[PDB]
Design an enzyme around this catalytic site. Sequence first.
Site, mmCIF file in Angstrom:
data_model
loop_
_atom_site.group_PDB
_atom_site.id
_atom_site.type_symbol
_atom_site.label_atom_id
_atom_site.label_comp_id
_atom_site.label_asym_id
_atom_site.label_seq_id
_atom_site.Cartn_x
_atom_site.Cartn_y
_atom_site.Cartn_z
ATOM 1 N N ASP A 63 -6.383 -15.685 5.645
ATOM 2 C CA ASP A 63 -7.447 -16.273 4.834
ATOM 3 C C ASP A 63 -8.358 -17.184 5.685
ATOM 4 O O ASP A 63 -9.569 -17.219 5.493
ATOM 5 C CB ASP A 63 -6.754 -17.000 3.653
ATOM 6 C CG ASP A 63 -5.697 -18.039 4.024
ATOM 7 O OD1 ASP A 63 -5.387 -18.215 5.196
ATOM 8 O OD2 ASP A 63 -5.172 -18.698 3.140
ATOM 9 N N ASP A 72 -7.272 -3.305 5.332
ATOM 10 C CA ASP A 72 -8.217 -2.829 4.318
ATOM 11 C C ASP A 72 -9.289 -3.886 3.971
ATOM 12 O O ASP A 72 -10.491 -3.596 4.010
ATOM 13 C CB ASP A 72 -7.496 -2.458 3.044
ATOM 14 C CG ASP A 72 -8.393 -1.941 1.904
ATOM 15 O OD1 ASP A 72 -8.164 -2.338 0.767
ATOM 16 O OD2 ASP A 72 -9.298 -1.136 2.125
ATOM 17 N N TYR A 75 0.787 -1.216 0.000
ATOM 18 C CA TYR A 75 0.000 0.000 0.000
ATOM 19 C C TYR A 75 0.824 1.274 0.000
ATOM 20 O O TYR A 75 0.268 2.336 -0.177
ATOM 21 C CB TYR A 75 -0.874 -0.028 1.215
ATOM 22 C CG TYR A 75 -2.357 0.038 0.980
ATOM 23 C CD1 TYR A 75 -3.038 -1.138 0.786
ATOM 24 C CD2 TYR A 75 -3.002 1.253 1.004
ATOM 25 C CE1 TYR A 75 -4.400 -1.113 0.611
ATOM 26 C CE2 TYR A 75 -4.361 1.295 0.834
ATOM 27 C CZ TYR A 75 -5.030 0.108 0.644
ATOM 28 O OH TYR A 75 -6.393 0.130 0.489
ATOM 29 N N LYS A 117 -0.382 -13.188 6.856
ATOM 30 C CA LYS A 117 -0.293 -14.308 5.910
ATOM 31 C C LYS A 117 1.166 -14.787 5.897
ATOM 32 O O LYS A 117 1.846 -14.899 4.871
ATOM 33 C CB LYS A 117 -0.787 -13.765 4.545
ATOM 34 C CG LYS A 117 -0.950 -14.857 3.510
ATOM 35 C CD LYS A 117 -1.958 -15.892 3.911
ATOM 36 C CE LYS A 117 -1.722 -16.899 2.847
ATOM 37 N NZ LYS A 117 -2.299 -18.151 3.240
#
Lengths: 414, 414
Positions: free
Chosen positions: B281, B305, B158, B228
């Site tokens: 996830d 986000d 980002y 992750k």
Amino acid sequence: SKVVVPAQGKKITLQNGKLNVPENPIIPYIEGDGIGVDVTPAMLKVVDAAVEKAYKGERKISWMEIYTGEKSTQVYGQDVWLPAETLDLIREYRVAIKGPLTTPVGGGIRSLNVALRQELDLYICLRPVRYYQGTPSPVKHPELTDMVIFRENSEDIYAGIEWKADSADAEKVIKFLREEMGVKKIRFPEHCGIGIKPCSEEGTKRLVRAAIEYAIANDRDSVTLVHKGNIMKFTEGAFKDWGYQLAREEFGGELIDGGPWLKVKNPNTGKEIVIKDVIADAFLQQILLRPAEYDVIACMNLNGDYISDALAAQVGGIGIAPGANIGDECALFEATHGTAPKYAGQDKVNPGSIILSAEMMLRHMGWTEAADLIVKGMEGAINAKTVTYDFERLMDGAKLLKCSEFGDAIIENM
Amino acid sequence: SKVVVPAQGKKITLQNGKLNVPENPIIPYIEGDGIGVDVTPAMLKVVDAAVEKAYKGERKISWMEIYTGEKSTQVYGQDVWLPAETLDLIREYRVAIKGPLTTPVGGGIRSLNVALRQELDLYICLRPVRYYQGTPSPVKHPELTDMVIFRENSEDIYAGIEWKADSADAEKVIKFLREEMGVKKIRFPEHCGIGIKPCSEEGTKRLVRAAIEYAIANDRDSVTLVHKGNIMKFTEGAFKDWGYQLAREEFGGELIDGGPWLKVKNPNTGKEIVIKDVIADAFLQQILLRPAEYDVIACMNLNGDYISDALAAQVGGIGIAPGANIGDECALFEATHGTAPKYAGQDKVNPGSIILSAEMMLRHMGWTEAADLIVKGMEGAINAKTVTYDFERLMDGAKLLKCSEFGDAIIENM
């Protein structure tokens, strides 16, 4: 070398883009670690029963066990987590199926699941999610979800190109980025890990072409490119532009109103397939609020990982979600959950994911009838409320079956 | 220079870590493009009414309009999308609030929302999501969701460090990565865009410290690091290890069983705060299936986000989700939706997001009473089914109000 190839059985053949499947094909399967010891026996049995029922004895799969993960170290020695011959054998026999894999920590080993996909260049991760009537769901209208995910498998941040904070390597790329590239936007250059996110034109067009082709072949209503291109312009935004460009240049897409959405005319059914795009974070909202608006999905590696998991929870499917890794030369079908070591050997987990990836397997082989028998069995067992612990906890009036018994319930409902 | 600072009113002061708020503070507000012209008038009115009611005339905000986005080009000239004095004024007056911003395409301009956060080093994006009884939701049990998101704002993918496919720049970094770094894992080096994902130790510990401090101050039950890290080990996995390390080194965390989860004893209430982690996830699934298990969330920029948007859809809140960008020297409260140009000027959209970010604003200022009056008003108007079009479509028995009238409905319910 330690795999025993079946006495009976014949290799599937690739006769330029097309599979030529014998009546007795040899299929490689990797059992999987953990609960793979429970789910794979269940799947071998319901696939055998369905090809027995569909073709009345004329056809039979010659299953050949191959090794990866924890079981590979017990067959070949403590250090070989992925034998080179698993890769040759999947290449050679063209289609295989696998249970859940354990990748170890401490040993500098990256994901064995991403290793198989990169090494065999299986650039499509195909995740279909639909609702099976009667599975418990956390949402009011799970039946409105019927999507098919085309997630790019070979590039993105998921490729594993990265360096540790304070390593000489990371220090060297940070120096190159600040000095030679002139980047002023790393807030803390010291004690900083660095990851690389690649997105190429050939990489995104081979995936998107497969997604539109899938929508023409199955006359689906739309292909939706989802990306985070308003912030990552040159990787995610490149993916949406290369996707749109391919629908224009190779499928004769035309603007709807003044764009950006395109129409592709299905050369077989005559219907129009809307090609559209939506930013990934508003899409994580749209799938909960407006799921009927979406159908074939095309996305990059990481987003496809998140979208598939979020969708699969919505249709009550964390344990019945099927998946496939398709390249041009072979395909690897798989249980999409983890190894769940706690339950391993107890015969209680849902065999549903690997059984439904086996029906995707049968369908890819052209054995459509055997594959329709498995989903008929699935819908019957679920509808019968003759279900496994994960579905039964959330249901009232359900009979609780072990993993192997849900296998038998699928055969009874065939 | 084109902003008129109020005749009456006093600056808020930073007296080392603590705000010293006058009775008549000057608050900068950016109206926002699009529907900002509808939502900001509504919020100025319900905040005025709530500080009027709480403090009986003793207190008053002196609102000072400042400029960014499309309105800035109409005040300062077609090319100034972010005036340098907006940044000086937010710095100077310490707290501001803003409506939705338009960032243009064609002009090489990156997100004006990320520009404000990076330029002012507002490293915390704080997104609280709770359910207001009676808002329409797509899930069966929205009331089980009460989470507070701490998303890192200054690093990750980002940050915008990236190069176009086929540019001389991208070509140069791809050459450096393949030649000097020896990377063999970019599948297609030609026509390839490249993005950089940085994660540093100071960057992740300033965010996680704020998350645990928030959980001690509000005696929340747990802080969950989501990452992750099984695939991005040196950025996302570094974030989970640096997070755990900070809860051990500065908050005296102790293993629960044999880890990896820690216990922090709240020095005020005596309760234990579980510090835990979950892969991003599976977490996108856990929030739908087991939301009551989670409470304070700490994550990197991109994941935060996605998590905030997914949560906000679950509690029926895409138009009532509040948010704040907090740094050490100032804070910027904001409407978390987009500019919705179609509805702009029609007075129909939900003013709920910017009104609830104004209550987060009031609470940060220590004006707790005025802030409790706004959420009392909110819950009453929603419960009264005296609602705006986005909530009314999904409800039966609701009265439909314009944006300004829902403002008045919040004041009536105070």
